[PDB]
Amino acid sequence: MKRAVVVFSGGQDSTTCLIQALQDYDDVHCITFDYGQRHRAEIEVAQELSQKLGAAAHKVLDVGLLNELATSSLTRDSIPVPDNTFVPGRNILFLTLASIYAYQVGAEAVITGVCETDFSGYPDCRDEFVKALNQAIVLGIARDIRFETPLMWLNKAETWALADYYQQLDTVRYHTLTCYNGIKGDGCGQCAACHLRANGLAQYQKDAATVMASLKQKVGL
Amino acid sequence: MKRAVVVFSGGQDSTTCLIQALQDYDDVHCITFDYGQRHRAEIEVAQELSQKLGAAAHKVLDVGLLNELATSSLTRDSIPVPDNTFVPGRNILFLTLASIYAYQVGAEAVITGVCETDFSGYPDCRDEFVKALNQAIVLGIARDIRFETPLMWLNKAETWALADYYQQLDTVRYHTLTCYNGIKGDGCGQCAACHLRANGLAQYQKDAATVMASLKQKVGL
Ligand SMILES: [Zn+2]
Ligand SMILES: [Zn+2]
Protein backbone atom coordinates (compact mmCIF):
# COMPACT_ATOMS: atom_id res chain seq x y z
CA MET A 1 0.00 0.00 0.00
CA LYS A 2 1.78 3.12 -1.33
CA ARG A 3 -0.27 5.69 0.57
CA ALA A 4 -0.18 9.50 1.01
CA VAL A 5 -1.85 12.23 3.05
CA VAL A 6 -2.85 15.48 1.35
CA VAL A 7 -3.22 18.56 3.42
CA PHE A 8 -6.45 19.69 1.81
CA SER A 9 -8.76 22.70 1.85
CA GLY A 10 -10.71 22.29 -1.43
CA GLY A 11 -9.07 25.18 -3.27
CA GLN A 12 -7.07 25.13 -6.52
CA ASP A 13 -3.71 24.30 -5.02
CA SER A 14 -4.67 21.48 -2.67
CA THR A 15 -7.05 19.92 -5.23
CA THR A 16 -4.18 20.01 -7.81
CA CYS A 17 -1.91 18.18 -5.29
CA LEU A 18 -4.76 15.66 -4.64
CA ILE A 19 -5.22 15.04 -8.35
CA GLN A 20 -1.51 14.42 -8.90
CA ALA A 21 -1.31 12.29 -5.71
CA LEU A 22 -4.15 10.06 -6.93
CA GLN A 23 -1.98 9.13 -9.98
CA ASP A 24 1.20 8.48 -7.93
CA TYR A 25 -0.21 6.67 -4.88
CA ASP A 26 -2.54 3.73 -4.49
CA ASP A 27 -4.35 5.36 -1.65
CA VAL A 28 -4.83 8.96 -0.69
CA HIS A 29 -6.23 10.42 2.49
CA CYS A 30 -7.08 14.08 2.82
CA ILE A 31 -6.78 16.05 6.04
CA THR A 32 -8.37 19.44 6.52
CA PHE A 33 -7.39 21.78 9.37
CA ASP A 34 -10.42 23.72 10.44
CA TYR A 35 -9.84 26.85 12.48
CA GLY A 36 -12.78 29.06 11.31
CA GLN A 37 -11.89 28.61 7.82
CA ARG A 38 -14.97 28.13 5.80
CA HIS A 39 -18.05 26.60 7.41
CA ARG A 40 -19.48 23.15 8.03
CA ALA A 41 -21.11 23.17 4.56
CA GLU A 42 -18.03 24.46 2.53
CA ILE A 43 -15.84 21.94 4.36
CA GLU A 44 -18.59 19.40 3.55
CA VAL A 45 -18.39 20.43 -0.13
CA ALA A 46 -14.60 19.92 -0.11
CA GLN A 47 -15.31 16.50 1.40
CA GLU A 48 -17.71 15.62 -1.51
CA LEU A 49 -14.97 16.85 -3.85
CA SER A 50 -12.36 14.54 -2.31
CA GLN A 51 -14.81 11.64 -2.10
CA LYS A 52 -15.81 12.21 -5.77
CA LEU A 53 -12.17 12.51 -6.88
CA GLY A 54 -11.22 9.19 -5.24
CA ALA A 55 -9.77 9.99 -1.75
CA ALA A 56 -10.01 6.91 0.50
CA ALA A 57 -10.81 9.16 3.45
CA HIS A 58 -11.04 12.75 4.52
CA LYS A 59 -10.31 13.73 8.09
CA VAL A 60 -11.40 17.15 9.32
CA LEU A 61 -9.52 18.22 12.42
CA ASP A 62 -10.51 21.25 14.56
CA VAL A 63 -7.39 23.37 15.16
CA GLY A 64 -9.17 26.28 16.73
CA LEU A 65 -6.49 26.37 19.42
CA LEU A 66 -4.47 28.36 16.92
CA ASN A 67 -6.95 31.22 17.35
CA GLU A 68 -6.38 31.02 21.10
CA LEU A 69 -2.75 31.94 20.33
CA ALA A 70 -3.54 35.29 18.64
CA THR A 71 -2.50 38.34 20.65
CA SER A 72 -6.11 39.59 20.94
CA SER A 73 -7.11 36.19 22.45
CA LEU A 74 -4.16 36.08 24.83
CA THR A 75 -4.80 39.59 26.10
CA ARG A 76 -8.48 38.63 26.46
CA ASP A 77 -7.47 35.55 28.51
CA SER A 78 -5.52 37.95 30.83
CA ILE A 79 -2.06 36.95 29.40
CA PRO A 80 0.55 39.75 29.19
CA VAL A 81 1.84 40.46 25.69
CA PRO A 82 4.48 43.06 24.91
CA ASP A 83 2.94 46.51 24.13
CA ASN A 84 -3.28 41.70 15.49
CA THR A 85 -4.67 38.27 14.55
CA PHE A 86 -1.31 37.10 13.33
CA VAL A 87 -0.13 33.70 14.49
CA PRO A 88 3.38 32.48 13.68
CA GLY A 89 4.27 29.01 12.53
CA ARG A 90 0.83 27.74 11.63
CA ASN A 91 2.26 25.35 9.02
CA ILE A 92 4.66 23.88 11.61
CA LEU A 93 1.49 22.81 13.33
CA PHE A 94 -0.19 21.59 10.19
CA LEU A 95 2.80 19.48 9.10
CA THR A 96 3.15 17.98 12.61
CA LEU A 97 -0.55 17.02 12.79
CA ALA A 98 -0.53 15.57 9.21
CA SER A 99 2.54 13.48 10.14
CA ILE A 100 0.88 12.13 13.28
CA TYR A 101 -2.18 11.34 11.11
CA ALA A 102 0.06 9.79 8.36
CA TYR A 103 1.76 7.58 10.98
CA GLN A 104 -1.61 6.34 12.23
CA VAL A 105 -2.99 5.46 8.75
CA GLY A 106 0.30 4.08 7.41
CA ALA A 107 1.08 6.88 4.96
CA GLU A 108 4.64 7.22 3.63
CA ALA A 109 4.14 10.85 2.50
CA VAL A 110 2.47 14.04 3.55
CA ILE A 111 1.72 16.29 0.56
CA THR A 112 1.37 20.02 0.93
CA GLY A 113 0.68 22.85 -1.53
CA VAL A 114 2.96 25.42 0.11
CA CYS A 115 5.43 27.47 -2.00
CA GLU A 116 8.06 30.20 -2.03
CA THR A 117 6.76 31.93 -5.15
CA ASP A 118 4.03 34.15 -3.69
CA PHE A 119 4.16 37.90 -3.01
CA SER A 120 4.22 37.05 0.67
CA GLY A 121 6.93 34.58 1.70
CA TYR A 122 6.04 32.74 4.88
CA PRO A 123 9.04 31.23 6.53
CA ASP A 124 7.06 28.12 7.63
CA CYS A 125 6.51 27.54 3.86
CA ARG A 126 10.12 27.67 2.70
CA ASP A 127 11.77 24.59 1.10
CA GLU A 128 14.62 24.83 3.61
CA PHE A 129 12.15 24.91 6.51
CA VAL A 130 10.10 21.91 5.27
CA LYS A 131 13.22 19.77 4.90
CA ALA A 132 14.47 20.84 8.34
CA LEU A 133 11.11 19.97 9.92
CA ASN A 134 10.87 16.68 7.98
CA GLN A 135 14.17 15.67 9.51
CA ALA A 136 12.99 16.49 13.05
CA ILE A 137 9.61 14.80 12.69
CA VAL A 138 11.17 11.61 11.34
CA LEU A 139 13.13 11.44 14.60
CA GLY A 140 10.19 12.32 16.84
CA ILE A 141 7.66 9.94 15.36
CA ALA A 142 10.25 7.14 14.71
CA ARG A 143 9.24 6.65 11.07
CA ASP A 144 10.43 7.90 7.67
CA ILE A 145 7.62 9.91 6.27
CA ARG A 146 8.42 12.23 3.33
CA PHE A 147 7.14 15.78 2.99
CA GLU A 148 6.35 16.57 -0.65
CA THR A 149 5.79 20.04 -1.96
CA PRO A 150 4.80 19.68 -5.64
CA LEU A 151 3.94 23.39 -5.88
CA MET A 152 7.09 24.71 -4.13
CA TRP A 153 8.63 26.37 -7.20
CA LEU A 154 5.48 26.95 -9.28
CA ASN A 155 3.56 30.11 -10.12
CA LYS A 156 -0.22 30.03 -10.50
CA ALA A 157 -0.05 29.65 -14.28
CA GLU A 158 2.11 26.53 -13.93
CA THR A 159 -0.27 25.14 -11.25
CA TRP A 160 -3.06 25.45 -13.81
CA ALA A 161 -0.82 23.67 -16.32
CA LEU A 162 -0.30 20.80 -13.86
CA ALA A 163 -4.06 20.33 -13.43
CA ASP A 164 -4.29 20.34 -17.26
CA TYR A 165 -1.43 17.77 -17.51
CA TYR A 166 -3.60 15.32 -15.53
CA GLN A 167 -6.52 16.25 -17.82
CA GLN A 168 -8.53 17.92 -15.07
CA LEU A 169 -8.31 21.65 -15.55
CA ASP A 170 -12.12 21.96 -15.73
CA THR A 171 -12.57 20.08 -12.42
CA VAL A 172 -10.32 22.60 -10.68
CA ARG A 173 -11.89 25.44 -12.59
CA TYR A 174 -15.55 24.80 -11.76
CA HIS A 175 -15.46 22.77 -8.53
CA THR A 176 -12.88 24.24 -6.24
CA LEU A 177 -13.21 27.19 -3.84
CA THR A 178 -10.48 29.83 -3.82
CA CYS A 179 -12.60 32.94 -3.47
CA TYR A 180 -12.56 34.68 -0.14
CA ASN A 181 -16.24 35.40 -0.56
CA GLY A 182 -17.37 31.73 -0.93
CA ILE A 183 -17.95 31.70 -4.69
CA LYS A 184 -16.80 28.48 -6.31
CA GLY A 185 -14.71 28.40 -9.43
CA ASP A 186 -13.91 31.82 -10.88
CA GLY A 187 -15.42 33.37 -7.77
CA CYS A 188 -16.39 36.96 -7.20
CA GLY A 189 -13.55 38.16 -9.44
CA GLN A 190 -13.07 40.95 -6.87
CA CYS A 191 -10.87 39.55 -4.11
CA ALA A 192 -7.12 39.03 -3.82
CA ALA A 193 -7.33 35.29 -4.17
CA CYS A 194 -9.65 35.53 -7.26
CA HIS A 195 -7.18 37.91 -8.89
CA LEU A 196 -4.18 35.69 -8.31
CA ARG A 197 -5.96 32.61 -9.63
CA ALA A 198 -7.48 34.41 -12.66
CA ASN A 199 -4.17 36.00 -13.64
CA GLY A 200 -2.67 32.54 -13.54
CA LEU A 201 -5.40 31.05 -15.68
CA ALA A 202 -5.15 33.84 -18.22
CA GLN A 203 -1.31 33.54 -18.58
CA TYR A 204 -1.75 29.82 -19.03
CA GLN A 205 -4.37 30.29 -21.79
CA LYS A 206 -2.41 32.95 -23.66
CA ASP A 207 0.93 31.08 -23.58
CA ALA A 208 0.12 27.43 -22.90
CA ALA A 209 3.03 25.59 -24.48
CA THR A 210 5.56 27.96 -22.93
CA VAL A 211 4.05 27.60 -19.42
CA MET A 212 3.74 23.85 -19.80
CA ALA A 213 7.35 23.79 -20.93
CA SER A 214 8.30 25.80 -17.84
CA LEU A 215 6.25 23.41 -15.65
CA LYS A 216 7.79 20.21 -17.07
CA GLN A 217 11.26 21.68 -16.69
CA LYS A 218 10.79 22.38 -12.95
CA VAL A 219 9.00 19.23 -11.71
CA GLY A 220 10.21 16.33 -13.92
CA LEU A 221 7.45 14.91 -16.16
CA MET B 1 13.06 41.41 29.69
CA LYS B 2 14.81 38.00 29.87
CA ARG B 3 11.69 35.85 29.66
CA ALA B 4 10.95 32.09 29.43
CA VAL B 5 8.03 29.74 28.90
CA VAL B 6 7.76 26.58 31.01
CA VAL B 7 5.80 23.69 29.71
CA PHE B 8 4.02 22.97 32.96
CA SER B 9 1.72 20.33 34.43
CA GLY B 10 2.15 20.86 38.20
CA GLY B 11 4.12 17.68 38.86
CA GLN B 12 7.63 17.29 40.30
CA ASP B 13 9.54 17.69 37.08
CA SER B 14 7.80 20.72 35.62
CA THR B 15 7.64 22.49 39.01
CA THR B 16 11.44 21.86 39.41
CA CYS B 17 12.02 23.47 35.95
CA LEU B 18 9.73 26.39 36.98
CA ILE B 19 11.64 26.90 40.21
CA GLN B 20 15.00 26.95 38.45
CA ALA B 21 13.60 29.18 35.66
CA LEU B 22 12.38 31.74 38.21
CA GLN B 23 16.04 32.20 39.35
CA ASP B 24 17.45 32.47 35.80
CA TYR B 25 14.80 34.61 34.07
CA ASP B 26 13.15 37.88 34.99
CA ASP B 27 9.80 36.66 33.83
CA VAL B 28 8.32 33.22 33.51
CA HIS B 29 5.13 32.13 31.84
CA CYS B 30 3.73 28.64 32.24
CA ILE B 31 1.80 26.81 29.57
CA THR B 32 -0.24 23.72 30.27
CA PHE B 33 -1.49 21.40 27.50
CA ASP B 34 -4.80 19.97 28.52
CA TYR B 35 -6.00 16.89 26.68
CA GLY B 36 -7.97 15.08 29.45
CA GLN B 37 -5.14 15.23 31.72
CA ARG B 38 -6.33 16.05 35.15
CA HIS B 39 -9.51 18.08 35.58
CA ARG B 40 -10.51 21.73 35.76
CA ALA B 41 -9.77 21.78 39.53
CA GLU B 42 -6.32 19.96 39.41
CA ILE B 43 -5.29 22.22 36.53
CA GLU B 44 -6.62 25.09 38.68
CA VAL B 45 -4.45 23.87 41.57
CA ALA B 46 -1.38 23.83 39.31
CA GLN B 47 -2.33 27.38 38.35
CA GLU B 48 -2.40 28.46 42.07
CA LEU B 49 0.98 26.74 42.40
CA SER B 50 2.48 28.72 39.51
CA GLN B 51 0.83 31.94 40.65
CA LYS B 52 2.11 31.35 44.23
CA LEU B 53 5.61 30.47 43.00
CA GLY B 54 5.88 33.70 40.95
CA ALA B 55 4.87 32.86 37.33
CA ALA B 56 3.80 36.05 35.50
CA ALA B 57 1.10 34.08 33.70
CA HIS B 58 -0.23 30.62 33.14
CA LYS B 59 -1.89 29.71 29.87
CA VAL B 60 -3.98 26.55 29.68
CA LEU B 61 -4.46 25.37 26.13
CA ASP B 62 -6.94 22.62 25.12
CA VAL B 63 -5.12 20.10 22.91
CA GLY B 64 -7.88 17.55 22.83
CA LEU B 65 -7.34 17.20 19.07
CA LEU B 66 -4.55 14.83 20.01
CA ASN B 67 -7.19 12.38 21.25
CA GLU B 68 -8.92 12.67 17.88
CA LEU B 69 -5.71 11.20 16.40
CA ALA B 70 -5.82 7.92 18.40
CA THR B 71 -6.63 4.85 16.30
CA SER B 72 -9.84 4.16 18.26
CA SER B 73 -11.04 7.73 17.46
CA LEU B 74 -10.07 7.53 13.80
CA THR B 75 -11.84 4.21 13.32
CA ARG B 76 -14.84 5.71 15.15
CA ASP B 77 -14.80 8.71 12.75
CA SER B 78 -14.96 6.16 9.84
CA ILE B 79 -11.21 6.58 8.92
CA PRO B 80 -9.42 3.42 7.69
CA VAL B 81 -6.44 2.37 9.79
CA PRO B 82 -4.25 -0.62 8.99
CA ASP B 83 -5.52 -3.84 10.68
CA ASN B 84 -4.69 1.40 21.09
CA THR B 85 -4.75 4.95 22.51
CA PHE B 86 -1.20 5.56 21.46
CA VAL B 87 -0.44 8.80 19.67
CA PRO B 88 3.01 9.47 18.20
CA GLY B 89 4.89 12.71 18.45
CA ARG B 90 2.87 14.42 21.13
CA ASN B 91 5.89 16.45 22.28
CA ILE B 92 6.48 17.68 18.71
CA LEU B 93 3.10 19.28 19.13
CA PHE B 94 3.79 20.58 22.60
CA LEU B 95 7.12 22.18 21.62
CA THR B 96 5.54 23.77 18.51
CA LEU B 97 2.64 25.27 20.49
CA ALA B 98 4.97 26.53 23.30
CA SER B 99 7.17 28.20 20.65
CA ILE B 100 4.20 29.92 19.03
CA TYR B 101 3.15 31.04 22.54
CA ALA B 102 6.78 32.12 23.38
CA TYR B 103 6.91 34.18 20.15
CA GLN B 104 3.67 35.95 21.06
CA VAL B 105 4.75 36.86 24.64
CA GLY B 106 8.35 37.68 23.73
CA ALA B 107 10.01 34.69 25.37
CA GLU B 108 13.57 33.77 24.37
CA ALA B 109 13.32 30.21 25.76
CA VAL B 110 10.91 27.34 26.04
CA ILE B 111 11.74 25.08 29.00
CA THR B 112 10.71 21.46 29.08
CA GLY B 113 11.20 18.65 31.61
CA VAL B 114 11.67 15.86 29.07
CA CYS B 115 14.58 13.37 29.42
CA GLU B 116 16.30 10.30 28.02
CA THR B 117 16.84 8.63 31.39
CA ASP B 118 13.49 6.89 31.92
CA PHE B 119 12.66 3.20 31.48
CA SER B 120 10.66 4.21 28.43
CA GLY B 121 12.57 6.31 25.88
CA TYR B 122 10.25 8.40 23.75
CA PRO B 123 11.89 9.54 20.59
CA ASP B 124 10.12 12.96 20.71
CA CYS B 125 11.98 13.43 24.05
CA ARG B 126 15.51 12.72 22.87
CA ASP B 127 18.22 15.45 23.05
CA GLU B 128 18.98 14.92 19.36
CA PHE B 129 15.30 15.34 18.47
CA VAL B 130 14.83 18.53 20.54
CA LYS B 131 17.84 20.19 18.90
CA ALA B 132 16.66 19.11 15.44
CA LEU B 133 13.18 20.53 16.10
CA ASN B 134 14.61 23.73 17.65
CA GLN B 135 16.47 24.32 14.43
CA ALA B 136 13.34 23.85 12.30
CA ILE B 137 11.10 25.99 14.50
CA VAL B 138 13.60 28.85 14.52
CA LEU B 139 13.27 28.89 10.73
CA GLY B 140 9.48 28.55 10.69
CA ILE B 141 8.68 31.20 13.25
CA ALA B 142 11.53 33.56 12.13
CA ARG B 143 12.94 34.02 15.63
CA ASP B 144 15.71 32.45 17.74
CA ILE B 145 14.00 30.80 20.62
CA ARG B 146 16.04 28.26 22.63
CA PHE B 147 14.70 24.92 23.83
CA GLU B 148 16.10 24.08 27.27
CA THR B 149 15.92 20.67 28.82
CA PRO B 150 17.35 21.00 32.36
CA LEU B 151 16.27 17.44 33.23
CA MET B 152 17.56 15.76 30.03
CA TRP B 153 20.35 13.75 31.68
CA LEU B 154 18.97 13.53 35.24
CA ASN B 155 17.49 10.65 37.20
CA LYS B 156 14.71 11.26 39.72
CA ALA B 157 17.13 11.43 42.66
CA GLU B 158 19.09 14.22 40.95
CA THR B 159 15.83 16.06 40.13
CA TRP B 160 15.06 16.04 43.85
CA ALA B 161 18.58 17.36 44.47
CA LEU B 162 17.97 20.23 42.04
CA ALA B 163 14.78 21.26 43.89
CA ASP B 164 16.85 21.11 47.11
CA TYR B 165 19.65 23.22 45.51
CA TYR B 166 17.11 26.05 45.07
CA GLN B 167 16.00 25.44 48.69
CA GLN B 168 12.54 24.21 47.73
CA LEU B 169 12.46 20.47 48.16
CA ASP B 170 9.49 20.72 50.56
CA THR B 171 7.46 22.79 48.07
CA VAL B 172 7.86 20.06 45.46
CA ARG B 173 7.32 17.38 48.06
CA TYR B 174 4.01 18.59 49.51
CA HIS B 175 2.48 20.73 46.75
CA THR B 176 2.97 19.02 43.45
CA LEU B 177 0.87 16.26 41.85
CA THR B 178 2.65 13.26 40.35
CA CYS B 179 0.31 10.51 41.47
CA TYR B 180 -1.87 8.94 38.84
CA ASN B 181 -4.65 8.74 41.37
CA GLY B 182 -4.81 12.52 42.16
CA ILE B 183 -3.05 12.45 45.54
CA LYS B 184 -0.72 15.39 46.02
CA GLY B 185 2.79 15.02 47.30
CA ASP B 186 3.79 11.46 48.16
CA GLY B 187 0.53 10.29 46.62
CA CYS B 188 -1.10 6.91 46.89
CA GLY B 189 2.30 5.21 47.09
CA GLN B 190 0.77 2.50 44.87
CA CYS B 191 1.10 3.70 41.28
CA ALA B 192 4.00 3.68 38.82
CA ALA B 193 4.57 7.39 39.05
CA CYS B 194 4.51 7.35 42.91
CA HIS B 195 7.09 4.55 42.89
CA LEU B 196 9.46 6.34 40.55
CA ARG B 197 9.26 9.58 42.52
CA ALA B 198 9.58 7.88 45.95
CA ASN B 199 12.55 5.78 44.86
CA GLY B 200 14.19 8.99 43.73
CA LEU B 201 13.49 10.76 47.00
CA ALA B 202 14.77 7.85 49.04
CA GLN B 203 18.09 7.57 47.06
CA TYR B 204 18.54 11.28 47.50
CA GLN B 205 18.01 11.07 51.29
CA LYS B 206 20.29 8.07 51.77
CA ASP B 207 23.17 9.43 49.65
CA ALA B 208 22.65 13.19 49.41
CA ALA B 209 26.17 14.52 48.89
CA THR B 210 26.92 11.88 46.27
CA VAL B 211 23.71 12.62 44.30
CA MET B 212 24.23 16.36 44.61
CA ALA B 213 27.78 15.84 43.40
CA SER B 214 26.42 13.86 40.44
CA LEU B 215 23.85 16.62 39.76
CA LYS B 216 26.38 19.50 39.85
CA GLN B 217 28.70 17.55 37.58
CA LYS B 218 26.02 17.11 34.87
CA VAL B 219 24.32 20.54 34.77
CA GLY B 220 27.00 23.12 35.70
CA LEU B 221 26.34 24.82 39.06
ZN1 LIG C 1 -13.37 36.40 -4.87
ZN1 LIG D 1 0.02 7.14 43.21
Write structural notes for this entry.
Chains A, B: Pfam families: QueC. The structure is a homodimer of 221-residue chains. With 221 residues, the first copy, chain A, is α/β, with parallel strands linked by helices. Chain A has 10 helices and 5 strands, in the order E-H-E-H-E-H-H-H-E-H-E-H-H-H-H. The first copy, chain A, has a 5-stranded parallel β-sheet, sandwiched between helices. In chain A, helix 1 (12-24) runs parallel beside helix 7 (156-165), helix 7 (156-165) packs across helix 9 (192-206) and helix 9 packs across helix 10 (208-219). Chains A and B meet through strand 3, helix 5 and helix 6 of A and strand 3, helix 5 and helix 6 of B. Bound molecules: zinc ion (ZN) (2 copies). One zinc ion binds at residues 179-181, 183, 187-188, 190-191, 194 of chain A.
CATH superfamily placement of chain A: HUPs
What sequence of helices (H) and strands (E) makes up the elements of chain A? EHEHEHHHEHEHHHH
For the biggest β-sheet of chain A, the strand order reads: 3-2-1-4-5
Quaternary structure: homodimer
Helix fraction bin of chain A: 40-55%
Classification by helices and strands of chain A: alpha/beta
Main sheet record of chain A? 5 strands, parallel
- Number of helix segments of chain A? 10
Give the CA-CA distance, first to last residue of chain A.
23 Å
The CATH topology of chain A is what?
A: Rossmann fold
Query: At CATH's second level, what is the architecture of chain A?
Result: 3-Layer(aba) Sandwich
Strand content of chain A: 5-15%
Largest interface: A-B, 50 and 50 residues
Summed up, the domain count of chain A is 1
PDB class: hydrolase
Keywords: YP_049261.1, hypothetical protein, Structural Genomics, Joint Center for Structural Genomics, jcsg, Protein Structure Initiative, PSI-2, hydrolase
Assembly: dimeric
Entry title: Crystal structure of a Queuosine biosynthesis protein queC (ECA1155) from Erwinia carotovora subsp. atroseptica SCRI1043 at 2.40 A resolution
